[PDB]
Design an enzyme around this catalytic site. Structure first.
Site, PDB file in Angstrom:
ATOM      1  CB  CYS B 195      -0.891   0.054   1.238  1.00 25.05           C
ATOM      2  SG  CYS B 195       0.004  -0.060   2.764  1.00 25.05           S
ATOM      3  CG  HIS B 222      -5.363   1.257   2.940  1.00 30.33           C
ATOM      4  ND1 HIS B 222      -4.455   0.343   2.469  1.00 30.33           N
ATOM      5  CD2 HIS B 222      -6.252   1.450   1.940  1.00 30.33           C
ATOM      6  CE1 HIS B 222      -4.781  -0.007   1.240  1.00 30.33           C
ATOM      7  NE2 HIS B 222      -5.870   0.652   0.894  1.00 30.33           N
ATOM      8  CG  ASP B 239      -6.993   0.966  -2.765  1.00 28.06           C
ATOM      9  OD1 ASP B 239      -6.093   0.281  -3.293  1.00 28.06           O
ATOM     10  OD2 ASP B 239      -7.148   1.006  -1.522  1.00 28.06           O
TER      11      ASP B 239
END
Ligand SMILES: *[C@@H]1O[C@H](CO)[C@@H](O[C@@H]2O[C@H](CO)[C@@H](O)[C@H](O)[C@H]2NC(C)=O)[C@H](O)[C@H]1NC(C)=O
Ligand SMILES: [Zn+2]
Lengths: 55, 333
Positions: B195, B222, B239
Protein backbone atom coordinates in the site's frame (compact mmCIF):
# COMPACT_ATOMS: atom_id res chain seq x y z
CA UNK A 1 -32.68 37.48 12.36
CA UNK A 2 -31.80 35.46 10.34
CA UNK A 3 -32.83 31.81 10.53
CA UNK A 4 -33.40 29.28 7.87
CA UNK A 5 -33.15 25.57 8.15
CA UNK A 6 -29.81 23.78 7.97
CA UNK A 7 -31.17 21.82 5.04
CA UNK A 8 -31.75 25.12 3.14
CA UNK A 9 -28.53 26.76 4.16
CA UNK A 10 -27.02 23.67 2.54
CA UNK A 11 -28.97 23.75 -0.76
CA UNK A 12 -28.21 27.49 -0.81
CA UNK A 13 -24.46 26.98 -0.53
CA UNK A 14 -24.92 24.12 -2.98
CA UNK A 15 -26.20 26.33 -5.79
CA UNK A 16 -24.51 29.68 -5.07
CA UNK A 17 -21.33 27.74 -5.82
CA UNK A 18 -22.37 24.94 -8.12
CA UNK A 19 -25.47 25.73 -10.11
CA UNK A 20 -25.89 29.50 -10.04
CA UNK A 21 -28.48 29.27 -12.77
CA UNK A 22 -30.89 27.90 -10.10
CA UNK A 23 -30.19 30.61 -7.45
CA UNK A 24 -33.22 32.70 -8.56
CA UNK A 25 -35.85 29.94 -8.33
CA UNK A 26 -34.33 28.79 -4.98
CA UNK A 27 -34.77 32.27 -3.62
CA UNK A 28 -38.34 32.03 -5.02
CA UNK A 29 -38.81 28.93 -2.93
CA UNK A 30 -37.43 30.44 0.27
CA UNK A 31 -39.66 33.48 0.43
CA UNK A 32 -42.30 30.95 -0.55
CA UNK A 33 -41.74 28.93 2.65
CA UNK A 34 -40.43 31.75 4.97
CA UNK A 35 -42.88 34.67 5.44
CA UNK A 36 -40.52 36.99 7.42
CA UNK A 37 -37.84 36.75 4.71
CA UNK A 38 -40.39 37.72 1.99
CA UNK A 39 -40.50 40.94 4.07
CA UNK A 40 -36.75 41.40 4.40
CA UNK A 41 -36.27 40.79 0.63
CA UNK A 42 -38.63 43.62 -0.38
CA UNK A 43 -37.97 46.01 2.56
CA UNK A 44 -34.30 45.86 1.64
CA UNK A 45 -32.66 43.16 -0.52
CA UNK A 46 -29.16 44.57 0.04
CA UNK A 47 -29.31 43.77 3.77
CA UNK A 48 -31.03 40.46 2.94
CA UNK A 49 -28.07 39.55 0.70
CA UNK A 50 -25.42 40.33 3.35
CA UNK A 51 -27.39 38.57 6.11
CA UNK A 52 -27.58 35.69 3.73
CA UNK A 53 -23.80 35.73 3.27
CA UNK A 54 -23.71 34.38 6.87
CA UNK A 55 -23.88 30.64 6.09
CA UNK B 1 -60.09 60.55 -13.65
CA UNK B 2 -57.49 60.37 -10.79
CA UNK B 3 -56.79 60.69 -7.94
CA UNK B 4 -58.11 57.32 -7.60
CA UNK B 5 -54.72 55.59 -7.38
CA UNK B 6 -53.77 53.69 -10.57
CA UNK B 7 -53.14 50.01 -9.83
CA UNK B 8 -50.39 49.26 -12.36
CA UNK B 9 -50.83 45.66 -13.61
CA UNK B 10 -49.41 43.52 -10.75
CA UNK B 11 -47.83 44.57 -7.37
CA UNK B 12 -44.20 44.46 -6.27
CA UNK B 13 -43.33 41.54 -8.58
CA UNK B 14 -40.15 41.05 -6.53
CA UNK B 15 -37.19 40.64 -8.80
CA UNK B 16 -35.27 37.54 -7.92
CA UNK B 17 -33.19 37.31 -11.09
CA UNK B 18 -31.97 40.73 -10.09
CA UNK B 19 -31.22 39.78 -6.52
CA UNK B 20 -29.81 36.39 -7.66
CA UNK B 21 -27.31 37.82 -10.17
CA UNK B 22 -26.58 40.27 -7.40
CA UNK B 23 -25.18 38.12 -4.51
CA UNK B 24 -23.26 35.85 -6.84
CA UNK B 25 -21.32 39.08 -7.16
CA UNK B 26 -21.25 39.65 -3.41
CA UNK B 27 -20.31 36.02 -2.71
CA UNK B 28 -17.23 36.21 -4.93
CA UNK B 29 -15.94 39.08 -2.73
CA UNK B 30 -16.64 37.03 0.38
CA UNK B 31 -14.66 34.15 -1.14
CA UNK B 32 -11.75 36.23 -2.45
CA UNK B 33 -11.53 37.82 0.99
CA UNK B 34 -11.43 34.47 2.82
CA UNK B 35 -8.45 33.28 0.76
CA UNK B 36 -6.30 36.31 1.56
CA UNK B 37 -3.64 37.57 4.05
CA UNK B 38 -2.85 35.15 6.92
CA UNK B 39 -3.56 37.92 9.45
CA UNK B 40 -1.11 36.96 12.33
CA UNK B 41 -4.17 36.45 14.63
CA UNK B 42 -4.97 32.96 13.25
CA UNK B 43 -1.28 32.46 12.64
CA UNK B 44 -0.62 31.79 16.34
CA UNK B 45 -3.72 29.60 16.43
CA UNK B 46 -1.82 27.56 13.84
CA UNK B 47 1.85 27.74 15.08
CA UNK B 48 0.37 26.88 18.45
CA UNK B 49 -2.18 24.12 17.62
CA UNK B 50 0.75 22.32 16.00
CA UNK B 51 2.15 22.13 19.60
CA UNK B 52 -1.11 21.42 21.53
CA UNK B 53 -1.70 18.46 19.31
CA UNK B 54 0.35 15.94 17.36
CA UNK B 55 -2.53 14.84 15.10
CA UNK B 56 -2.09 18.40 13.96
CA UNK B 57 1.70 18.17 13.53
CA UNK B 58 0.91 14.91 11.76
CA UNK B 59 -1.27 16.47 9.13
CA UNK B 60 1.08 19.47 8.86
CA UNK B 61 4.07 17.25 8.25
CA UNK B 62 2.25 15.14 5.67
CA UNK B 63 0.99 18.23 3.85
CA UNK B 64 4.60 19.16 3.38
CA UNK B 65 5.70 15.80 2.10
CA UNK B 66 2.59 15.11 -0.03
CA UNK B 67 1.04 18.23 -1.64
CA UNK B 68 3.78 19.76 -3.77
CA UNK B 69 5.85 16.61 -4.30
CA UNK B 70 4.16 14.92 -7.26
CA UNK B 71 4.14 18.06 -9.35
CA UNK B 72 7.53 17.40 -10.89
CA UNK B 73 8.02 17.53 -14.65
CA UNK B 74 11.30 15.68 -14.47
CA UNK B 75 9.53 12.83 -12.76
CA UNK B 76 6.39 13.00 -14.88
CA UNK B 77 8.45 12.58 -17.95
CA UNK B 78 10.48 9.60 -16.62
CA UNK B 79 7.30 7.80 -15.65
CA UNK B 80 5.90 8.42 -19.07
CA UNK B 81 9.08 7.18 -20.78
CA UNK B 82 8.88 4.13 -18.53
CA UNK B 83 5.22 3.15 -18.81
CA UNK B 84 3.96 1.35 -21.92
CA UNK B 85 1.78 4.15 -23.23
CA UNK B 86 1.15 2.33 -26.48
CA UNK B 87 -0.47 -0.46 -24.55
CA UNK B 88 -2.33 1.77 -22.09
CA UNK B 89 -3.82 4.08 -24.63
CA UNK B 90 -4.68 1.15 -26.92
CA UNK B 91 -6.84 -0.53 -24.33
CA UNK B 92 -8.29 2.80 -23.24
CA UNK B 93 -9.15 3.36 -26.88
CA UNK B 94 -10.56 -0.17 -27.24
CA UNK B 95 -12.93 0.43 -24.29
CA UNK B 96 -13.95 3.81 -25.59
CA UNK B 97 -14.88 1.84 -28.72
CA UNK B 98 -17.57 -0.26 -26.98
CA UNK B 99 -19.41 3.06 -26.63
CA UNK B 100 -18.23 5.49 -23.93
CA UNK B 101 -21.56 6.98 -22.71
CA UNK B 102 -23.92 9.06 -24.96
CA UNK B 103 -21.95 12.07 -23.53
CA UNK B 104 -18.26 11.16 -24.09
CA UNK B 105 -17.99 14.36 -22.04
CA UNK B 106 -14.53 13.96 -20.58
CA UNK B 107 -15.47 10.36 -19.98
CA UNK B 108 -12.28 9.40 -21.82
CA UNK B 109 -10.39 10.58 -18.74
CA UNK B 110 -12.24 8.08 -16.57
CA UNK B 111 -11.61 5.22 -18.93
CA UNK B 112 -7.91 6.16 -18.78
CA UNK B 113 -7.74 6.11 -15.00
CA UNK B 114 -9.48 2.72 -14.94
CA UNK B 115 -7.09 1.27 -17.46
CA UNK B 116 -4.10 2.64 -15.58
CA UNK B 117 -5.36 0.78 -12.53
CA UNK B 118 -5.42 -2.42 -14.59
CA UNK B 119 -1.99 -1.95 -16.11
CA UNK B 120 -0.54 -1.08 -12.76
CA UNK B 121 -1.88 -4.16 -11.05
CA UNK B 122 -2.17 -6.86 -13.68
CA UNK B 123 1.07 -5.75 -15.32
CA UNK B 124 3.32 -3.21 -13.88
CA UNK B 125 3.87 -3.47 -10.13
CA UNK B 126 3.88 -6.48 -7.77
CA UNK B 127 3.01 -7.08 -4.09
CA UNK B 128 5.61 -8.03 -1.58
CA UNK B 129 5.01 -9.42 1.92
CA UNK B 130 8.30 -11.15 2.48
CA UNK B 131 10.65 -10.81 -0.49
CA UNK B 132 11.81 -13.61 -2.79
CA UNK B 133 15.23 -15.02 -2.20
CA UNK B 134 17.82 -13.17 -4.22
CA UNK B 135 19.89 -16.22 -4.96
CA UNK B 136 17.26 -19.04 -4.92
CA UNK B 137 14.44 -18.85 -7.48
CA UNK B 138 11.66 -16.30 -7.89
CA UNK B 139 8.60 -18.00 -6.36
CA UNK B 140 10.29 -18.55 -3.03
CA UNK B 141 9.35 -16.27 -0.11
CA UNK B 142 7.85 -18.57 2.56
CA UNK B 143 11.26 -19.99 3.46
CA UNK B 144 12.53 -16.54 4.47
CA UNK B 145 12.55 -15.79 8.14
CA UNK B 146 13.12 -12.13 9.04
CA UNK B 147 15.97 -10.79 11.22
CA UNK B 148 14.46 -7.36 11.67
CA UNK B 149 15.11 -4.00 10.21
CA UNK B 150 17.93 -1.58 9.91
CA UNK B 151 19.25 1.52 8.19
CA UNK B 152 19.99 1.84 4.53
CA UNK B 153 23.39 1.08 3.13
CA UNK B 154 25.23 3.66 1.02
CA UNK B 155 23.51 2.77 -2.27
CA UNK B 156 19.88 2.52 -1.13
CA UNK B 157 20.46 5.65 0.97
CA UNK B 158 20.17 7.62 -2.25
CA UNK B 159 16.55 6.76 -2.70
CA UNK B 160 15.15 8.32 0.43
CA UNK B 161 15.07 5.18 2.48
CA UNK B 162 14.69 4.79 6.20
CA UNK B 163 14.31 1.14 6.89
CA UNK B 164 15.68 -1.87 5.18
CA UNK B 165 13.97 -5.06 6.26
CA UNK B 166 16.49 -7.91 6.01
CA UNK B 167 15.59 -11.58 5.67
CA UNK B 168 17.45 -14.91 5.84
CA UNK B 169 16.81 -17.71 3.35
CA UNK B 170 16.70 -20.98 5.26
CA UNK B 171 17.27 -22.97 2.08
CA UNK B 172 20.57 -21.26 1.09
CA UNK B 173 21.69 -18.93 3.89
CA UNK B 174 21.95 -15.72 1.88
CA UNK B 175 20.21 -12.57 3.00
CA UNK B 176 17.72 -10.86 0.73
CA UNK B 177 16.96 -7.29 1.82
CA UNK B 178 13.88 -5.15 1.17
CA UNK B 179 14.63 -1.51 1.31
CA UNK B 180 11.63 0.71 1.87
CA UNK B 181 11.97 3.67 -0.46
CA UNK B 182 10.05 6.95 -0.76
CA UNK B 183 11.57 8.04 -4.06
CA UNK B 184 8.83 6.97 -6.36
CA UNK B 185 11.22 7.02 -9.34
CA UNK B 186 13.13 4.24 -7.60
CA UNK B 187 9.93 2.21 -7.40
CA UNK B 188 9.58 2.41 -11.17
CA UNK B 189 12.70 0.23 -11.15
CA UNK B 190 12.02 -2.13 -8.24
CA UNK B 191 8.34 -2.52 -9.17
CA UNK B 192 7.27 -4.02 -5.89
CA UNK B 193 6.03 -3.22 -2.44
CA UNK B 194 3.13 -2.82 -0.07
CA UNK B 195 0.00 0.00 0.00
CA UNK B 196 2.68 2.42 0.96
CA UNK B 197 4.72 2.45 -2.18
CA UNK B 198 2.01 1.07 -4.33
CA UNK B 199 0.23 4.33 -3.51
CA UNK B 200 3.33 6.61 -3.79
CA UNK B 201 3.99 5.47 -7.32
CA UNK B 202 0.35 5.38 -8.32
CA UNK B 203 -0.27 8.95 -7.24
CA UNK B 204 2.72 10.08 -9.25
CA UNK B 205 1.49 8.05 -12.23
CA UNK B 206 -1.88 9.68 -12.10
CA UNK B 207 -0.21 13.08 -11.84
CA UNK B 208 1.96 12.34 -14.86
CA UNK B 209 -1.12 12.31 -17.09
CA UNK B 210 -1.85 15.72 -15.74
CA UNK B 211 -4.85 14.50 -13.85
CA UNK B 212 -5.96 16.30 -10.70
CA UNK B 213 -4.94 13.81 -8.01
CA UNK B 214 -4.79 13.36 -4.21
CA UNK B 215 -3.18 11.16 -1.56
CA UNK B 216 -5.77 9.92 0.92
CA UNK B 217 -4.48 8.92 4.34
CA UNK B 218 -6.41 6.73 6.79
CA UNK B 219 -5.01 6.78 10.29
CA UNK B 220 -5.65 3.07 10.60
CA UNK B 221 -2.80 2.26 8.18
CA UNK B 222 -3.98 2.50 4.61
CA UNK B 223 -3.42 4.94 1.81
CA UNK B 224 -5.01 5.65 -1.50
CA UNK B 225 -5.93 8.12 -4.17
CA UNK B 226 -8.57 10.57 -5.15
CA UNK B 227 -8.87 11.73 -8.75
CA UNK B 228 -11.14 14.39 -10.09
CA UNK B 229 -13.54 13.15 -12.74
CA UNK B 230 -14.67 16.06 -14.84
CA UNK B 231 -17.24 13.73 -16.26
CA UNK B 232 -18.73 13.01 -12.81
CA UNK B 233 -17.60 16.34 -11.84
CA UNK B 234 -16.68 15.27 -8.26
CA UNK B 235 -13.72 13.52 -6.69
CA UNK B 236 -13.51 9.76 -7.36
CA UNK B 237 -11.92 7.21 -5.05
CA UNK B 238 -9.09 5.32 -6.63
CA UNK B 239 -7.27 2.45 -4.85
CA UNK B 240 -4.51 0.86 -6.89
CA UNK B 241 -3.93 -2.11 -4.62
CA UNK B 242 -7.51 -3.20 -5.03
CA UNK B 243 -7.62 -2.12 -8.68
CA UNK B 244 -10.76 -0.26 -7.55
CA UNK B 245 -12.41 2.76 -9.18
CA UNK B 246 -15.41 4.20 -7.45
CA UNK B 247 -15.82 2.22 -4.31
CA UNK B 248 -15.17 4.29 -1.16
CA UNK B 249 -17.27 1.86 0.87
CA UNK B 250 -14.74 -0.90 0.12
CA UNK B 251 -12.91 -0.32 3.40
CA UNK B 252 -15.77 0.38 5.78
CA UNK B 253 -18.20 -2.22 4.54
CA UNK B 254 -16.57 -4.89 2.27
CA UNK B 255 -13.47 -5.26 4.41
CA UNK B 256 -15.36 -4.35 7.58
CA UNK B 257 -12.43 -2.21 8.63
CA UNK B 258 -12.96 0.07 11.59
CA UNK B 259 -11.70 3.67 10.84
CA UNK B 260 -11.59 7.05 12.67
CA UNK B 261 -10.16 9.77 10.33
CA UNK B 262 -9.41 10.20 6.59
CA UNK B 263 -7.42 13.09 5.15
CA UNK B 264 -6.76 14.04 1.51
CA UNK B 265 -3.62 15.89 0.39
CA UNK B 266 -2.97 17.66 -2.96
CA UNK B 267 -1.40 20.69 -4.66
CA UNK B 268 -4.65 22.55 -4.27
CA UNK B 269 -5.44 21.74 -0.65
CA UNK B 270 -5.92 19.43 2.32
CA UNK B 271 -9.47 18.22 3.08
CA UNK B 272 -11.14 15.93 5.62
CA UNK B 273 -12.66 13.22 3.51
CA UNK B 274 -13.69 10.94 6.36
CA UNK B 275 -17.31 11.19 5.65
CA UNK B 276 -16.74 9.63 2.20
CA UNK B 277 -15.23 6.53 3.64
CA UNK B 278 -16.14 6.04 7.29
CA UNK B 279 -19.67 5.03 6.68
CA UNK B 280 -20.00 2.38 9.54
CA UNK B 281 -17.69 0.71 12.09
CA UNK B 282 -16.95 4.28 12.97
CA UNK B 283 -14.24 4.60 15.57
CA UNK B 284 -14.17 7.42 18.08
CA UNK B 285 -12.64 10.57 16.62
CA UNK B 286 -10.77 11.50 19.77
CA UNK B 287 -7.63 13.00 18.42
CA UNK B 288 -8.32 16.63 17.85
CA UNK B 289 -11.12 19.09 18.54
CA UNK B 290 -13.24 18.92 15.39
CA UNK B 291 -13.34 22.71 15.27
CA UNK B 292 -9.50 22.76 15.26
CA UNK B 293 -9.22 20.22 12.42
CA UNK B 294 -11.51 22.31 10.23
CA UNK B 295 -9.33 25.27 10.95
CA UNK B 296 -6.14 23.32 10.37
CA UNK B 297 -7.07 22.25 6.85
CA UNK B 298 -8.44 25.62 5.94
CA UNK B 299 -5.31 27.41 7.01
CA UNK B 300 -3.11 25.00 5.04
CA UNK B 301 -5.34 25.05 1.99
CA UNK B 302 -5.34 28.85 2.23
CA UNK B 303 -1.52 28.89 2.55
CA UNK B 304 -1.27 26.55 -0.39
CA UNK B 305 -2.87 29.23 -2.59
CA UNK B 306 -1.20 32.68 -2.03
CA UNK B 307 0.29 32.64 -5.48
CA UNK B 308 -2.96 31.70 -7.26
CA UNK B 309 -5.02 34.38 -8.99
CA UNK B 310 -8.57 35.53 -8.22
CA UNK B 311 -10.20 33.34 -10.89
CA UNK B 312 -8.32 30.37 -9.57
CA UNK B 313 -8.89 31.09 -5.92
CA UNK B 314 -12.64 31.20 -6.59
CA UNK B 315 -13.17 28.32 -8.98
CA UNK B 316 -11.26 26.13 -6.49
CA UNK B 317 -13.27 27.36 -3.46
CA UNK B 318 -16.48 26.31 -5.24
CA UNK B 319 -15.21 22.84 -5.97
CA UNK B 320 -14.45 22.61 -2.27
CA UNK B 321 -17.92 23.76 -1.37
CA UNK B 322 -19.51 21.36 -3.80
CA UNK B 323 -17.56 18.69 -1.91
CA UNK B 324 -18.70 19.76 1.55
CA UNK B 325 -22.30 19.47 0.53
CA UNK B 326 -21.53 16.00 -0.93
CA UNK B 327 -19.97 14.88 2.31
CA UNK B 328 -22.32 16.76 4.64
CA UNK B 329 -25.18 15.15 2.80
CA UNK B 330 -25.19 11.44 2.04
CA UNK B 331 -24.78 11.59 -1.76
CA UNK B 332 -23.41 12.86 -5.11
CA UNK B 333 -24.87 15.91 -7.00
C1 LIG C 1 -3.09 -3.20 3.33
O1 LIG C 1 -3.40 -2.85 2.02
C2 LIG C 1 -3.89 -3.97 1.31
C3 LIG C 1 -4.23 -3.64 -0.15
O2 LIG C 1 -5.54 -3.17 -0.37
C4 LIG C 1 -5.09 -4.66 1.96
O3 LIG C 1 -5.08 -5.97 1.44
C5 LIG C 1 -6.91 -6.22 1.31
O4 LIG C 1 -7.28 -6.71 2.56
C6 LIG C 1 -8.66 -6.78 2.59
C7 LIG C 1 -9.03 -7.09 4.02
O5 LIG C 1 -9.53 -8.39 4.05
C8 LIG C 1 -9.11 -7.85 1.60
O6 LIG C 1 -10.47 -7.63 1.37
C9 LIG C 1 -8.42 -7.76 0.24
O7 LIG C 1 -8.55 -8.99 -0.45
C10 LIG C 1 -6.95 -7.41 0.41
N1 LIG C 1 -6.29 -7.05 -0.83
C11 LIG C 1 -5.65 -8.01 -1.48
C12 LIG C 1 -6.28 -8.53 -2.76
O8 LIG C 1 -4.60 -8.45 -1.00
C13 LIG C 1 -5.09 -4.64 3.49
O9 LIG C 1 -6.40 -4.83 4.00
C14 LIG C 1 -4.46 -3.32 3.97
N2 LIG C 1 -4.32 -3.20 5.40
C15 LIG C 1 -5.15 -2.44 6.11
C16 LIG C 1 -6.59 -2.84 6.17
O10 LIG C 1 -4.75 -1.45 6.70
ZN1 LIG D 1 18.07 -18.94 -1.08
Amino acid sequence: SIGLTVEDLLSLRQVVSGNPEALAPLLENISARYPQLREHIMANPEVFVSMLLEA
Amino acid sequence: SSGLVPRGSHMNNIDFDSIAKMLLIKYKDFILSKFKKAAPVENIRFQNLVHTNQFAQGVLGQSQHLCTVYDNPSWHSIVLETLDLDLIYKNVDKEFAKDGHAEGENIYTDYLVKELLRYFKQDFFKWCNKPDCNHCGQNTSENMTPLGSQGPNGEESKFNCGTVEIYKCNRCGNITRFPRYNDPIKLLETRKGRCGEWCNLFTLILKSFGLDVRYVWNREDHVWCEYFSNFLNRWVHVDSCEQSFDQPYIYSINWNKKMSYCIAFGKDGVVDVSKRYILQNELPRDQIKEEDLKFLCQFITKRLRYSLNDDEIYQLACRDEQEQIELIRGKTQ
